[PDB]
């Protein structure tokens, strides 16, 4: 007890918060600060030195800077990926059965059903790269959700996490590569790829460095990376040959029949009236994804649920359809 | 409507005003009233009033049941003796008589210990058999034998709803919330109604719980009368325990009507369908015998290659990869590799003699001792392989029959239930050799012979091993593995006072108090006895750091069914022994992602015993995500036990006592490698 309450002199008044740079195998690490002060001191207790993941903020002192403790960082990583297993499988959507069996056969052959993968002796651990004209996570998450049935998943949506802060660099990509290293049986999903589309000179070098570390120059077959953008013309031609090496496919235009199937899937569990017609619903829409029709299915089920009824009448589903007609025109 | 015309009618206490006003209350009693029966302050004089007094009692119990009461509601009905699909009968009978007769049976069941409550219970039984809303009135009438005439009075045509629903949730809440004797009423009455009905395999589970000799007879003359066959012989032999197989083969050898139940009663017809069908439709890869048989070295990973080699019993290449592989191996590996031929020859009974005969009567005593171990493992019903070992038995210090006693007595206990194995085991335990595994495989042998016995015998067998247990207080490993067999004899029942008899003649210095707490472990297979759960939390903080491990390790056996309460804050503590208690208490279940998380946190540790004993349950609970923990151990290690045990985790990856005894005996790995010579002969694996 006294030995536990005797190191209080180091963590007392002379205490600071620094940024550690790296750990040296010679039991003396190098730290930094706003002016970059490098002090090497033999390690102390309360530190892990293994899960610390150097390159983050640690605790320093006004003394010789003996490391007395650490502080966890980035709660921002929590909003990166989902850890749940949704019930949406590859058999819940139709029409693109070949388009979904191309990626299912593409990334579900490694690490699962390995007699057609390890006996051949190819191992292209790169995965396909897709793009959805509707986007907004509906089609791209309806194709990536096939891998989410029984497996670990890794999700990355939007290039904002690189542009919402100072140019720290590819260190966050190194965090995704170390969590993918410690989580090898996973699927890397990059969504809303608009790095160059949205300083600007550093975005090109952290994007080309993203291509460098994404190529896997030192790592063996560890994880299948699946990228997903919105516009194929925003990506430079240099990000294609190193990144996309397995296969790519095209997605048809969802005008009437794909919106009819999306409407059927979004209206399969719900109960609708007999007078609810389909031609006006697949007619009034114009280049719409599934998030807004899911929004009017939610507010239509709640609005119809106001009368303590689960049946959605035709006039109430057109009254909710006015949100679709207005939102895309606004 | 308004109470203007009918309100001044209940105030007159005259007999005609009651005999005409009360029928109007029965007419308007279809929905009770227009309100919550606020007329209590006006009918409280009718309470004291009395021609149609049973109607006054009916309306009185109607209003008292309507607003609130705990004891005064069913009195007008036990005194009334009611004689005078609508909404009236549904309201006044269904819910009002549901809670009414429920609180009457509860108050009369807890207060006093005549027949009026039985007449009410049968009347409500019939009325709620007409109501046809199941499991509500049932789940209320559980606690009131009367349940026998209730089930045989109800189980006539509704079989799927009462059997599936009532037996499912009433059996779950009958092992969870109901004590033992009423569960025995479930077993006997379920033997009745299920004997008169179909679905024999659930009655066979009622034989897994009853362990009675009549159920198998009636289900074999009825299953024989009702015409696959080898399949129900397979799970027939799986569901049966050590007693009713021996008794089953002696009653079927007493009847000998067809000898097909004699053929199915042994291990031959449970293995002859499996092996060819497994070799045909499944094709295991050779990259794990060549790979996992190639990265081995240091004379220990090679032992892990003898165990992975023992996994085959399709491909028998690593088995028949020439010779000298056992000659290069040391004693700790001569016994294990000697038993590898027994692990790889679980089938091919006739071939076992011509495969093991080459190593029999050899020059090294351990080669032929482990060869007799193989002869004991390969067979369990042939009983024609243990003649030479059982013959001599005469060394009294050491001549090939203390090690041949290890392999032949252990493998014979695995293949054991006659007295004329214990009349010969009397000089075995009476020998008192310095070798631990002599009394080890002796107590485990007779213990596995005495599992599931007729409530447990306290004869000179366990009395002899207790007296000779307390003979000398040296090599306390004897005190660690003799309570193993003691508990194997105490196993099979919880209510017995035999554990308190051990608390009488056993209690001593904390060695035999640890014996007594092992008897406490195995003498509490499981029931509704939360008293030992709060007592578990009370004695959980004992200074002795081993009775915590075993007595707290009993968690996986006590609450083995209700797995929602098994996860607790044992990992949040600071004692490494508790981390072992949870780590072993994970189990060998289907291995949900929560368990894989508990191994994702328990895996990272610094002690070689916990990091050594994590992959056993980690890969036992998961037999996609199978290769990730192996890569994790490759990243942690790259000691010897971690590499041999991670290759043994490559072995593991790719309510009977036979699946409970081996690992509970295996909970002694924190010692010399002598225990690891008994590690290679586990039988709990599938």
Curated annotation (Swiss-Prot), chain A:
Its main location: cytoplasm. There is a cross-link at residue 143 (Glycyl lysine isopeptide (Lys-Gly) (interchain with G-Cter in ubiquitin)). One of its GO terms (cellular component) is proteasome complex. It is found in: Cytoplasm; Nucleus; Membrane. It comes from the Eukaryota. GO terms for molecular function: ATP binding; ATP hydrolysis activity; proteasome-activating activity; RNA binding. Transmembrane segments: none annotated. ATP binds at residues 132-139. Keywords: Acetylation, ATP-binding, Cytoplasm, Deafness, Intellectual disability, Isopeptide bond, Lipoprotein, Membrane, Myristate, Nucleotide-binding, Nucleus, Phosphoprotein, Proteasome, Ubl conjugation. It is linked to Birk-Aharoni syndrome: An autosomal recessive disorder characterized by failure to thrive, severe developmental delay, intellectual disability, spastic tetraplegia with central hypotonia, chorea, hearing loss, micropenis and undescended testes, as well as mild elevation of liver enzymes. Component of the 26S proteasome, a multiprotein complex involved in the ATP-dependent degradation of ubiquitinated proteins. This complex plays a key role in the maintenance of protein homeostasis by removing misfolded or damaged proteins, which could impair cellular functions, and by removing proteins whose functions are no longer required. Therefore, the proteasome participates in numerous cellular processes, including cell cycle progression, apoptosis, or DNA damage repair. Component of the 19S proteasome regulatory particle complex. The 26S proteasome consists of a 20S core particle (CP) and two 19S regulatory subunits (RP). The regulatory particle is made of a lid composed of 9 subunits, a base containing 6 ATPases including PSMC1 and few additional components. Interacts with SCA7. Interacts with NGLY1. Interacts with PAAF1. Belongs to the AAA ATPase family. This is 26S proteasome regulatory subunit 4. It comes from Homo sapiens (Human). The chain holds residues 93 to 432 of 440 of the full protein.
UniProtKB/Swiss-Prot annotation, chain B:
It comes from the Eukaryota. The modification Phosphothreonine is found at residue 19. PC repeats lie at residues 336-369, 370-406, 407-438, 441-475, 484-513, 642-654. Keywords: Acetylation, Phosphoprotein, Proteasome, Repeat. The keyword Ion transport does not apply. Found in skeletal muscle, liver, heart, brain, kidney, pancreas, lung and placenta. The modification Phosphoserine is found at residues 11, 24, 292, 294. PANTHER family: 26S PROTEASOME NON-ATPASE REGULATORY SUBUNIT, 26S PROTEASOME NON-ATPASE REGULATORY SUBUNIT 2. Belongs to the proteasome subunit S2 family. This is 26S proteasome non-ATPase regulatory subunit 2.
């Amino acid at each position: 007890e006294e030995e536990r309450s005797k190191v209080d002199d180091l963590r007392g008044t002379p205490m600071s918060v620094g940024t550690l740079e790296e750990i040296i195998d010679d039991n003396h690490a190098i730290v930094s600060t706003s002016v970059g002060s490098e002090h090497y001191v033999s390690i102390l207790s309360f530190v892990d030195k293994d899960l610390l993941e150097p390159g983050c903020s640690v605790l320093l002192n006004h003394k010789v800077h003996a490391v007395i403790g650490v502080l966890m960082d980035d709660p921002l990583v929590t909003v990166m990926k989902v850890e749940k297993a949704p019930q949406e499988t590859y058999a819940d959507i139709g029409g693109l059965d070949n388009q979904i069996q191309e990626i299912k056969e593409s990334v579900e052959l490694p690490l699962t059903h390995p007699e057609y993968y390890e006996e051949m002796g190819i191992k292209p651990p790169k995965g396909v790269i897709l793009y959805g004209p509707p986007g907004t996570g509906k089609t791209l998450l309806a194709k990536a959700v096939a891998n989410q049935t029984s497996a670990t998943f890794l999700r990355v949506v939007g290039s904002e996490l690189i542009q919402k802060y100072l140019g720290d660099g590819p260190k966050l990509v190194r965090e995704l590569f170390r969590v993918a290293e410690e989580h090898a049986p996973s699927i890397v999903f990059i969504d809303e790829i608009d790095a160059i589309g949205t300083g600007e000179r550093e975005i090109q070098r952290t994007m080309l460095e993203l291509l460098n570390q994404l190529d896997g120059f030192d790592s063996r077959g560890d994880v299948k990376v699946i990228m997903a953008t919105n516009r194929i013309e925003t990506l430079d031609p240099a990000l294609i040959r190193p990144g996309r090496i397995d296969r790519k496919i095209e997605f048809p235009l969802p005008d009437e029949k794909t919106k009819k199937r999306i409407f059927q899937i979004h209206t399969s569990r719900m109960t609708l009236a007999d007078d609810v017609t389909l031609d006006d619903l697949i007619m009034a829409k114009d280049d719409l994804s599934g998030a807004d029709i899911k929004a009017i299915c939610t507010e239509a089920g709640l609005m119809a649920l106001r009368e303590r009824r689960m049946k959605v009448t035709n006039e109430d589903f057109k009254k909710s359809k006015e949100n679709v007609l207005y939102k895309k025109q606004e | 409507r308004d109470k203007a015309p009918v309100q001044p009618q209940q105030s007159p206490a005259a007999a005609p005003g009651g005999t005409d006003e009360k029928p109007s209350g029965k007419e308007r009693r279809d929905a009770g009233d227009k309100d919550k029966e606020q007329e209590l302050s006006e009918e409280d004089k009718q309470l004291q009033d009395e021609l149609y007094r049973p109607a006054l009692e009916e309306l009185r119990r109607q209003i008292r049941s309507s607003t609130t009461s705990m004891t005064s509601v069913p009195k007008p009905l036990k005194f009334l003796r009611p004689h005078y699909n609508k909404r009236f009968a549904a309201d006044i009978i269904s819910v009002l008589a549901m809670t009414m007769s429920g609180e009457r049976e509860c108050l009369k069941y807890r207060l006093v210990g005549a027949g009026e409550v039985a007449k009410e219970w049968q009347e409500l039984d019939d009325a709620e058999k007409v109501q046809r809303e199941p499991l509500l009135t049932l789940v209320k009438e559980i606690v009131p034998l009367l349940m026998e005439i209730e089930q045989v009075d109800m189980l006539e045509k509704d079989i799927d709803e009462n059997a599936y629903a009532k037996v499912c949730l009433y059996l779950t809440s009958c092992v969870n919330y109901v004590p033992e004797p009423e569960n025995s009423a479930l077993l006997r009455c379920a033997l009745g109604v299920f004997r008169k009905f179909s679905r024999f395999p659930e009655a066979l589970r009622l034989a897994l719980m009853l362990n009675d000799m009549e159920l198998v007879e009636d289900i074999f003359t009825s299953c024989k009368d009702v015409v696959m066959l080898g399949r129900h012989g397979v799970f027939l032999e799986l569901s049966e325990d050590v007693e009713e197989y021996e008794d089953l083969t002696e009653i079927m050898s007493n009847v000998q009507l067809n000898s097909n139940f004699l053929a199915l009663a042994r291990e031959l017809d449970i293995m002859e369908p499996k092996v060819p069908d497994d070799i045909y439709k499944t094709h295991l890869e050779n990259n794990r015998f060549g790979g996992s048989g190639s990265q081995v070295d240091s004379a220990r990973m090679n032992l892990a290659s003898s165990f992975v080699n023992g996994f085959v019993n399709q491909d028998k290449l690593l088995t028949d990869d020439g010779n000298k592989w056992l000659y290069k191996n040391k004693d700790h590996g001569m016994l294990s590799a000697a038993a590898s031929l027994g692990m790889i020859l679980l089938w091919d009974v006739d071939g076992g003699l011509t495969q093991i005969d080459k190593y029999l009567y050899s020059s090294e005593d351990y080669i032929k001792s482990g060869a007799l171990l193989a002869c004991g493992i390969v067979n369990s019903g042939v009983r024609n392989e243990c003649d030479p070992a059982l013959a001599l038995l005469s060394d009294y210090v050491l001549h090939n029959s203390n090690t041949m006693r290890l392999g032949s007595i252990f493998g014979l206990g695995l293949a054991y239930n006659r007295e004329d194995v214990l009349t010969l085991l009397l000089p075995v335990m009476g020998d008192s050799k310095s070798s631990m595994e002599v009394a080890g495989v002796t107590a485990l042998a007779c213990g596995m012979i005495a599992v599931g016995s007729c409530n447990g015998d306290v004869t000179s067998t366990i009395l002899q091993t207790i007296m000779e247990k307390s003979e000398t207080e040296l090599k306390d490993t004897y005190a660690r593995w003799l309570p193993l067999g003691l508990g194997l004899n105490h196993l099979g029942k919880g209510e017995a006072i035999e554990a308190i008899l051990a608390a009488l003649e056993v209690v001593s210095e904390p060695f035999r108090s640890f014996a007594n707490t092992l008897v406490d472990v195995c003498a509490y297979a499981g029931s509704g006895n939360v008293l030992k759960v709060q007592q578990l939390l009370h004695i959980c903080s004992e200074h002795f750091d081993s009775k915590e491990k075993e007595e707290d390790k009993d968690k996986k056996e006590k609450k083995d069914k209700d797995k929602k309460e098994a996860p607790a804050d044992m990992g949040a503590h600071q004692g490494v022994a508790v981390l072992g208690i949870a780590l072993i208490a994970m189990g060998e279940e289907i291995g949900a992602e929560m368990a894989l998380r508990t191994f994702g946190h328990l895996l990272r540790y610094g002690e070689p015993t916990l990091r050594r004993a994590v992959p056993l349950a980690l890969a036992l609970i998961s037999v996609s995500h199978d290769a990730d923990p192996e890569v994790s151990y490759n990243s942690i290690f790259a000691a010897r036990l971690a590499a041999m045990l991670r290759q043994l985790a490559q072995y593991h990856a790719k309510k009977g006592t036979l699946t409970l005894c081996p690992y509970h005996s295996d909970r002694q790995l924190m010692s010399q490698v002598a225990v690891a010579g008994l590690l290679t002969v586990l039988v709990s694996f599938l």
